[PDB]
Design a protein around this ligand. Sequence first.
Ligand SMILES: [Zn+2]
Ligand SMILES: [Zn+2]
Length: 609
Amino acid sequence: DHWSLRPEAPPEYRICEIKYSKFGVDDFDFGFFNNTPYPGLENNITNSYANSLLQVMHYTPLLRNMALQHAATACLADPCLLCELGYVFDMLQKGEGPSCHATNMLRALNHTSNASVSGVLEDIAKDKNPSTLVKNLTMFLFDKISQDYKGTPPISTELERTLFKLNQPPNPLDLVKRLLETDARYQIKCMHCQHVSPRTATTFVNKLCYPAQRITFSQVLKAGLENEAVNKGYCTKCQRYQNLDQRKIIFNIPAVLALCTEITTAEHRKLWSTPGWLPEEIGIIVDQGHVYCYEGDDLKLHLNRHNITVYSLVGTVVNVETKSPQKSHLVATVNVGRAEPESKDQDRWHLFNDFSVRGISKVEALTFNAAWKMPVVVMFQVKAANHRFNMDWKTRLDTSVLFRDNNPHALKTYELLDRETEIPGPDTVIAIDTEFIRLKISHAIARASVVRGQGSREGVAFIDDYIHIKETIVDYLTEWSGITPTDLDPINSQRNLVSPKTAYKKLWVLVNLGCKFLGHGLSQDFRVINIQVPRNQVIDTSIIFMKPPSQRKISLAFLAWYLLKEDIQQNTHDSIEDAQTALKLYRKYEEFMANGSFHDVLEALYKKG
Ligand SMILES: [Zn+2]
Ligand SMILES: [Zn+2]
């Protein structure tokens, strides 16, 4: 009937391999694995286990908004996982192609504090099981982005204010706590003199708890949130060690409810394999330090009769086992309808097996198999937050990073944008080109040049950032890029050497400002830059000068030689020059189209080898 009923993982659930060539990743047919408007994530990256989690979080409206409202600020923190989260979320909502990738964000994770000791790095972590890794990451991320959010005031808290029906705008500290934390504390009572003493409790992600017939998910959730225990400890009142009654007094439940299944035994898998065991909708009651959860018709009855906060199931991080050779990898089954305008079709579940995306039924999404298909992380959010969004992060996007000057050297190869006269917009055209280096084939941006495409200073660069790469560079590609170790050396560089996220922030802002990116073969640049740019914001000269059927692209050097009569390969490649070259080529294209000679020129371009 459906895939999850099979004794083994069907090809739709198996690991998807990327096949490589000399051309590289770009020639690989990602479109074969995804025919949906919902892009997947590529899995040829270190710590790519995060893909399933990133997907589930992205289609959680409160989480996506949270990240975007922060990323749109003037935050120059690097590494900063919340900013990186905003970038990835932005790519997943902008992406017109079949696949995206979170290279920059997984690289930044590797540099994040306490990452090497939180078991979130598959090369360092003790337990290298993907299910364990994504459990730790879920806890690690929720903790990190919570303090990242309060670091600098977000662009807008208007969504949350409306959601929580507040009158005055809430402050970040109280807000992020209501969104992610389970407000609670431990009441430690001496069982002799009945003396009570409090112990603070911090909880971002909760863990399910199982007993040991008719065991429900609501009961397992309730058992997980609460915590009653008895341990011997000293009592200050009666001056001796007594039995202490310790109960977790619960005050508030988070707007975003992340849950770890903690499946360890065979009995746990038998329980989860029960058809219809996982409800897509739950209601939780917090009364006098206790938590009461309801589901199904039992939930409907209580609602007809109180403090019942209805939660909607967003998605599930699922562990998929393969019998031979024995292993495991993660996929994501998500209802993408939660983050979309409300329609009649509420059931919009999709399978996110890395870059392989497929639509599935509610049954399949809520069906689990004790042999190979088991849930790891379950994501709920308040139903009132469904189909909600806020565009103030884009409307009031902070652009200070474009105008700020922190370059010590007086000799620059760029002239920054004037804050008054040169404010980028939808009509603004910019020419861009980058330079690559080799990492321990893995490429990385070593230099990014953006050039004015119009105005009196047309051709003059306003961005020429060199990247302080915190990785090990195998090859500088000096013949190909003209990049020397001195240019990237923080002590001896004469360049505007900046952090990776600092330079990325500029480009990310320019995209959301609506700017049109002009260049030659920009698809390779954007991939290594790790960004997604809409088609109507891309002016590519390699695409422009194609004769329609051939699909073969002309070199930048040949176009410059034939249309501009220039030799641009004399010295080593310079990203500013190559950007100016592409801009010149586009201006020639405008001339050819205007006088109606473009057809003849295009024909002339294709005559010999
Ligand atoms: Zn940030
Ligand atoms: Zn006592």
